[PDB]
Amino acid sequence: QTQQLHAAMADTFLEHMCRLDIDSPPITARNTGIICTIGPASRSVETLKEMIKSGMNVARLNFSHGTHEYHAETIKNVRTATESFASDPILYRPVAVALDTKGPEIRTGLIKGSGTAEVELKKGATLKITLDNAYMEKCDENILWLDYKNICKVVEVGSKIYVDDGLISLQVKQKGADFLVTEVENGGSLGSKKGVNLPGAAVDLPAVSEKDIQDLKFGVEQDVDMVFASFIRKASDVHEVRKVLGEKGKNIKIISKIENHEGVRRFDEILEASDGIMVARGDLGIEIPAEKVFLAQKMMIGRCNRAGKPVICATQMLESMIKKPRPTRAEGSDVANAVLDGADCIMLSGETAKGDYPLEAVRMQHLIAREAEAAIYHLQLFEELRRLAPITSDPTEATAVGAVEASFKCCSGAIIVLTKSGRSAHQVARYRPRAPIIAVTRNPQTARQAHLYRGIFPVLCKDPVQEAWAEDVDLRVNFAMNVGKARGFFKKGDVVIVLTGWRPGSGFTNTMRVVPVP
């Protein structure tokens, strides 16, 4: 038995678990999108080509750092490597480009302006925090500058302050009008321009700073597929991002990063307003107790699955692979469990952006996700997503669920979906079939954006529109068959589900056919 099909027939979850089988090889298709952060280790054209071959689907640009021109060149190299495979349209793989905003970050200043300079803060020592720019480049063991002007307004005597991704902690003893006097609680060696978290503080920085405004405008001009908007606290923040992008960037997907308590409490209204959600475990594990992160992760992935919107699990997934060519057992486990949880995508940060094994990290993500998709208990997942999804009069929605039902019944090799905007394919993906969803499109952007949805293998038809509708459908359907056979999803004589519109220019995908592979 293949792809855990022995465990798939179990009537209980428990028995399904008991039947999982390390000798039951998975199918070749991998449904979960892989998002890579690009930096020094992975920004060369030649390295990017191997990232694509290994499984990268989306390139993430971290606008916390780097100049516009530095990112412009990262974008170019990505497009260059992606297009280098375009000569064969059957084998071509769209690669999305995402921009991760700085958002309302709080950063320290420079330590004695030296570079190789740190100070060892001793636990129990006092440290003054000032906001006076004359100290902007003169930080040491007694005085510390940071860039959050109104920090005194939202902090109180007894408040905690984390510095350098939570490695150092301080507790505030005194407030002056425009300074803080703190006591070191967790000692450490403090470098320069490090990140500051204020857990439980009602931080009043703008959702979109002036810099973000510029950054978003830059993204529009560079044709980015999606925006990962940092530190989203409420629905109004999303609407702000939406308004900046405006008319010109209306088709750019906005993915809200939930990285603090507020985002978690306001999660429902953020989800309603966004196109998708990133569980940003880095900051979140600082802002709320680390032992509670898994709950937030599961809750958010559950609600997105329920709502039908993509959700990305991020940060520290294969962390130890920054230095090592293999991951820990806990890391292998965390990737698989993000998939079983329901994550549409998984993400690499430092592993791809700066580490010593960017390609091995991508490869490992691809291998684990594939195993985990086979182990999904589709029988219960399908029963539940239905029960929790409303009665609609939308015909493409009815069609989509009919097709997933049909794909489980004939165990089909794929669900081929013809789509312009991608919506029809998304509506199929939300019901989580086991068969890969081959979305044939002519819109290059919809092709790139489809990577956000579990199961979608997006495919770009380069052929010009034939005037005879029936023939043009056939062209696109046959192209999907050819892609499938080439990648080994299925072979001649296999059964596939094909979804198409009935009428030329209906805007509905309301037709399903069960069809042998030619």
Ligand X SMILES: O=C(c1ccc(NS(=O)(=O)c2cccc3cccnc23)cc1)N1CCN(c2cnccn2)CC1
Ligand Y SMILES: O=C([O-])C(=O)[O-]
311 belongs to the binding site for a second copy (CB under 8 A)? no
Helix (H, G, I), strand (E, B) or coil at 34: strand
Residue in 155, 314, 429, 435 binding ligand Y, rule: CB under 6 A = 314
* Interface of this chain with a second copy, residues 439 to 498, rule: CB under 8 A: 495, 497
Backbone discontinuities in the chain, residue before each (C to N > 2.5 A): none
CA distance 128 to 106: 17
Is 315 assigned a catalytic role? yes
Q: Is 257 assigned to a binding site?
A: yes
Q: Two tokens at 438?
A: 């081959």
Nearest-angstrom CA–CA distance, 198 and 203: 8
Does residue 262 bind Mg ion (CB under 5 A)?
A: no
Nearest to 366 by CA among 342, 348, 341: 348
Residue 100 or 472 having the CB closest to Mg ion: 100
173 carries an active-site annotation: no
Which part of the chain contacts a second copy (CB under 8 A), choosing from 90-98, 396-404, 452-460, 482-490? 396-404
Identify which of residues 339 and 452 has a Cβ nearer to ligand X in the complex.
Answer: 339
* Bridge partners, residue 129, by sequence: 144, 180
How buried is 325 (Cβ within 10 angstroms: 0-12 exposed, 13-18 middle, 19+ buried)? exposed
The catalytic residue among 43, 253, 257, 454 is 257
212 binds Mg ion (CB under 5 A): no
**Least Å from the CB of residue 145 to a second copy:** 23
Cβ at position 372, least distance to Mg ion in Å: 24
Residue from the set 392, 466, 478, 506 that interacts with a second copy by CB under 8 A: 392
Residue 487 identity (one-letter amino acid): R
Q: Does 100 bind Mg ion (CB under 5 A)?
A: no
**From Mg ion, ligand Y, ligand X, none, interface partner of 281 (C-beta below 5 to 8 A by class):** ligand Y
* Binding to a second copy, residues 56-95 (CB under 8 A): none
Under 8 Å between Cβ of 119 and 169: no
Taking the least distance from each CB to ligand Y, the nearer of 230 and 441 is: 230
**CB under 5 to 8 A by kind: which of Mg ion, a second copy, ligand X, none does 283 bind?**
Mg ion
Start-to-end Cα distance in the chain: 25
Would the annotation count 62 as a binding residue?
Answer: yes
Residue 60 designated active-site:
yes
Residue 68 buriedness (CB in 10 A; 0-12 / 13-18 / 19+): middle
- Running DSSP on this structure, what letter comes out for residue 135? G
| Residue 164 engages Mg ion in binding (rule: CB under 5 A) | no
> Which residues in this chain contact ligand X in the complex, by CB under 6 A?
13-14, 17, 298, 305, 340-342, 376-377, 380-381, 384
CB distance 228 to 278 below 8 Å: yes
Q: Does 269 bind a second copy (CB under 8 A)?
A: no
Q: How far is the CB of 314 from ligand Y (least distance, A)?
A: 5
* x-marked contacts with a second copy along 208-247 as a string, rule CB under 8 A: ----------------------------------------
CB contact burial 397-431 (16+ within 10 A = b; e otherwise): bebbbebbebbbeeebbbbbbbbeebbbbbbbbbb
Query: Annotation-wise, does 476 bind a ligand?
Result: yes
- Give the number of other Cβ atoms within 10 Å of residue 458's Cβ: 25
423's contact among Mg ion, ligand Y, a second copy, none, with CB below 5 to 8 A by partner kind, is: none
Among 262, 283, 319, 344, binds Mg ion (CB under 5 A): 283
Question: How many helices and strands in the chain, by DSSP H and E?
Answer: 19, 21
Assess 280 for contact with ligand Y (CB under 6 A): yes
**CA distance linking residue 274 with residue 308, whole number of Å:** 12
Annotated binding-site residue? 93 = yes
**In which element (H, E) is residue 441 found?**
strand 437-441
In degrees, to the nearest 5, what angle opens at C-alpha 212 toward C-alphas 194 and 170? Answer: 25
The verdict on whether residue 140 carries a ligand-binding annotation is no
Q: Which residues are catalytic?
A: 60, 107, 257, 315
Binding residues for beta-D-fructose 1,6-bisphosphate: 419-424, 469, 476, 503-508
Please give the residue ranges that form the binding site for Mg ion (CB under 5 A).
259, 280, 282-283
Binding residues for ATP: 62-65, 107, 194
Please give the residue ranges that form the binding site for ligand Y (CB under 6 A).
230, 257, 259, 280-283, 314-315, 349
